[model samples]
Target chain A: MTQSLREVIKAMTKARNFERVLGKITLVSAAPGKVICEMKVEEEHTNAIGTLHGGLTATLVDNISTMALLCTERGAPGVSVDMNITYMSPAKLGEDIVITAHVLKQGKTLAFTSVDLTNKATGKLIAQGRHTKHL
Target chain B: SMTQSLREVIKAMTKARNFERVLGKITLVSAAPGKVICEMKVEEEHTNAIGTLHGGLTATLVDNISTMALLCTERGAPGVSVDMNITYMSPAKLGEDIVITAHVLKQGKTLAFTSVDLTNKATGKLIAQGRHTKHL
Candidate 1:
């Protein structure tokens, strides 16, 4: 059965507990085994040189992939098996960025997901990620 | 080999957007050029619904520390992160601080390999570990 946006958001809000620091960055989209999340690029999120931190992008990929799994059936209890993230662009501070994650394949014991990050204002692709999980 | 004090690393992080400013909440206990020891008291902002430190925040903490370790080098080139992988072994609960340290396993001309260990500040039990690859 495919999960709707409302169902997935409700579950995420419950799992993550909507709060201050650990709250939802942004729910870009939600569907069966897929999720998109975004966060505003604040000055606190930038590096010394003023470029978007690579780890921040990686963190976004990690969180969005986890959300995708949470929305999947076999993802009842899931954890990251492995992740490969490649940073392509450097987003500046004060820019909003969005991440989109989709399950490429879901098997009984393993699942694969792809995550793409982009600048919301400039519409530039920032990073691409691949994640594997064991259910 | 690059060698610096923990204070220097923290100071550099404060000037950059790459390192999460929240990391400053922690205290550095020890540090070498390629490694460092740090601790931070867990608060509500760091926890998930179950009162455990959020996994994402934990990963970011580890990554930030590792990034500093990698930046200790004096290489005359720009540094970039190639990849990193984190493995969470246990839950980090709220109200308790965590101690994290990172070390460089191998340093090459173009790439560096490093590892980080996260432990409970009070108990010193292993919480998470990560490996990273950096390019210069």
Candidate 2:
């Protein structure tokens, strides 16, 4: 039987330890095959310029992609095949940023997903991603 | 890539923690023009079950070079990278630092386009290539 959305969310949230870490990471909203994750700018995440670290934004998309991927297959083991990320603008420190990841295609052994990062308050797009995974 | 006059700015603004340092040490060479060449010594940590460099590490390498390109540009713009696409063509094994070179293709008002090439630092064999975009 195909996995239900509830079961999928449960397994992913549990397996990835999202329930605990998500609080520290970012939380916006979620639906089937799509999720919006948010992060509040912390001092540790900033660079010397006081803007959000580039890698931090990269990590946001990476983390969100994993969540969206898990939403589709539930418990299937997989790894990131590839991802292309583009930077749009600096995320100011102390601002809340949201990242939305969605599945584009799911094949028998591969999946395609995309993510967009934006500032929650300003509603400005920050970064975007195109990711693929092999199950 | 950085211009001659902006050399100081390039040096000051482009800094990374563990990963880039590791790459520089392993590769045993410094680069300018936002392009870097690195060589990785083949070891267990660098490989997967197939005896090749782990895809994850390779992806990180791609990202480092691409981000460096963004930082070195003369655009006088400061922004975070928004997207990158990488394609892996061949597998790399340890004992050599894989060399990577990155360049800016197009810098627009809102976005920067870039690309990277990963090759065997010794043999000059192309292993992978990537495309990236950054918002300023």
Candidate 3:
């Protein structure tokens, strides 16, 4: 009686989980090698300057990419071996940002993933992150 | 002016304290020129689905503390994060107090480079390593 990875992701994201401190992340879709999620920048998501927090940006990359991996693999998802994030623009409060994660390559014990976050209104680039997961 | 710069860095750390929901109760152990050390325990909210420290929390620590190291160098402002890279070595379990040390590797006119290490306070095992580049 195993549920699909998509359902599992939906269940977790909808609940009050650990990452709840950032904000609510709504899962849009999860394919074999791709996953998409979105959330609005609330006060909790901002820094002292009222812009989106860089820590939250890194967390999104570390998480959404793991969701992409779950589409193909089973078990505990995998531990993040390495993660790199580049910030190009600042997101403001109440701004809706779209996050898309893609699995670049998936091997038996390792997976490479890429993710991008963009503003929904202006379509401006917000941040991009790369993740290497050790399975 | 030197004291002012250090004070600004402390303010930056304190400013982030408003984010207590995400960072939990992080205590600054010490701060020196181009170096900052902090300690925090792994709370239930800081874990992932696997019941260990979340990678995102590790990333957050790197981002915040590395920025503090930059501020220790007489730069009153924590510059924008141009890029940040984190390497997770081992998983830390809940209830483990971890120590994070951020050190400035190099600083220039327009950019700063810093390295951070998160280790288990009891056993001194590495949990994650992070490098950050910031630009003004």
TM-scores of chain A across candidates? 0.78, 0.78, 0.86
Interface RMSD of each: 3.7, 6.5, 2.0
**Candidate with better TM-score, 1 vs 3:** 3
Tell me model 2's lDDT, rounded to 2 decimals: 0.61
- Order of the predicted models by lDDT, top scorer first: 3, 1, 2
The share of true interface contacts that also appear in candidate 3 amounts to: 0.65
Best by TM-score: 3
Q: What lDDT score goes with residue A90 in model 2?
A: 76
Model 2, residue B18: distance off in Å is 11
Candidate order by DockQ, highest to lowest?
Answer: 3, 1, 2
Candidate 2 stretches with Cα past 4 Å from truth are: A1-32, B1-28, B32-34, B39-64, B67-83, B89-97, B104-113, B119-127, B133-136
User: lDDT tens string, model 3, B1-136?
Assistant: 5445545555555445344246645777878888888888987778887788888888888888887777777764578888999988899999999999999998888888999999999999999999999886
Better of 1 and 2 by DockQ: 1
Cα-based RMSD of the predictions, in order?
4.4, 6.6, 3.2
lDDT value, residue A107 of candidate 3: 78
Per-residue CA lDDT of model 2 for A1-135, tens digit only, reads 213433444443343221212234534565657877677876655655677665545545655676676665463425666777767777787888888889888888888888887889889987777877776
Query: How well is each residue in A19-126 modelled by candidate 3, as lDDT tens digits?
Result: 565446777777777888888988778775788888888888988888787776463377899999999999988899999899898778888999999998888999
Q: State the displacement of the C-alpha of residue B93, model 1, in Å, after optimal TM-score superposition.
A: 1.9
lDDT of residue B19 for candidate 1: 42
Per-residue CA lDDT of candidate 2, range B7-119, in tens?
A: 44334433543222223334324455555444456555555434566554565566655665666666645455566677666667756557777777778889877787878
